[PDB]
Symmetry: none
Subunit: 250 residues, 2 copies
């Protein structure tokens, strides 16, 4: 009708790949994608012609051309490049990795990252997805968002218990959103994962629309939430403010 | 069995039509760029919208962040290492020197891959060895075309301590070195990491134009002068980096 299911299946094949299993057979991909082998074979051959996969010896690999499509999101969103120097200022000051988060349905996606080298690794790459309900980024992105947006997120939010302190209910989400509006930032402790503490502050575009958040995380082994707030809040808010200015916010 | 699904090609053609020049384009702008009819592109946009990859409003369209999540199903570093091996062997055979792939990690360069040669008196590096970006050919070739914020991080995290007789000691000096590298197309250093050690590195690119590593090669001043080594080794360090760049889809 207006729905091209093969496009869906094309993505399903790409997403069936595991970063840690770089060279699967057709059969492994089709089982992962939940698609028939003839479907997967035809998709693979198309993706190969387009330069996204390479096939050899019954096995298949992604190519770097697979990162190229993602790079178009960044190229067409100037906030990403502008973010980098501001995130570096956060990472240097705190010695904690600094990120730009953007809303994508019920998830937040890490759109840009300045990592710090520890073994005590708070591990996410660009394109990593985390639920909005359970994160500081989520809350700083939803605190000033429309009610319909929020409901649409809530409807899709699994509200899993991910850490010892993860909120349970949407009624509870709403109480955290209220705090964020009063604070001007979100703080979460042990909600996305055991031992994980995060701050995030909203970034505004020229219209005063919250288009992203500057975020910084620590381990509870390094700081208590109150310590992390006292230490890191000033530079997280200053980074978001500058980034907002960069976008033409007044 | 047809081995080709056109609408998958068209889906990508539409996704790729969004860029710095078309951040929020209309249907007509997208259809023109993709080389497709507007009805076809309309149907593809509506499918991509349902899948959460684009968002449409007021006759204009945007990529959502969802496309970012595709790349995380890939390790480029693993792939670069695998593709590197044959090219590094080529370099080791032509130069008679251990050939390495270097990658950037913060202010350090890591020896990601290595093809060693056999000498009694040897240049000793294992995979995983880190050397500072500020003091090395590999560092300089990894930084010379890197975004300002990447160079800025290195600077903030570098000690700039003297390691060999000729190590640069300042950000201003590093910056001058990087300009020389942009102009040369490769880095050459001598005596900056250790007395008697001379090094060359050339940048490697992937499909998206990003410098993803360097092909590198070192010698001893007992076997070569810096000018001598640059003569005999640069051509094939360059050819190896260019061949590996191609393996990685660089146009």
């Amino acid at each position: 009708r207006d729905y091209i299911q093969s496009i869906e299946r094309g993505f399903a094949v790409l997403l069936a790949f595991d970063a840690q299993r770089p060279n699967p057979t057709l059969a492994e991909l089709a089982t992962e994608a939940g698609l028939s082998r003839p479907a997967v074979r035809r998709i693979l051959l198309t993706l190969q012609k387009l330069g996204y996969v390479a096939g050899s010896g019954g096995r298949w690999s992604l190519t770097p051309r697979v990162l190229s499509i993602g790079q178009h999101y960044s190229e067409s969103h100037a906030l990403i490049e502008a973010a980098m120097p501001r995130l570096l200022e956060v990472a240097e000051k705190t010695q904690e990795s600094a990120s730009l988060g953007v809303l994508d349905g019920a998830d937040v996606v890490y759109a840009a990252r300045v990592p710090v080298r520890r073994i005590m690794s708070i591990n996410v790459s660009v394109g990593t997805r985390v639920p909005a309900y359970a994160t500081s980024m989520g809350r700083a992105l939803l605190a000033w968002a429309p009610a319909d947006v929020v409901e649409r997120v809530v409807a899709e939010s699994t509200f899993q218990k991910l850490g010892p302190e993860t909120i349970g209910t949407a009624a509870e989400l709403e109480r955290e959103l209220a705090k964020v509006r009063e604070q001007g930032f979100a703080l979460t402790s042990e909600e996305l994962e055991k031992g994980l503490i995060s701050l995030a502050a909203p970034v505004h575009d020229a219209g005063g629309t919250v288009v992203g958040v500057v975020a910084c995380s620590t381990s509870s082994a390094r700081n208590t939430p109150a310590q992390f707030r006292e230490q890191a809040v000033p530079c997280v808010l200053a980074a978001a403010a500058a980034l907002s200015a960069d976008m033409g916010f007044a």
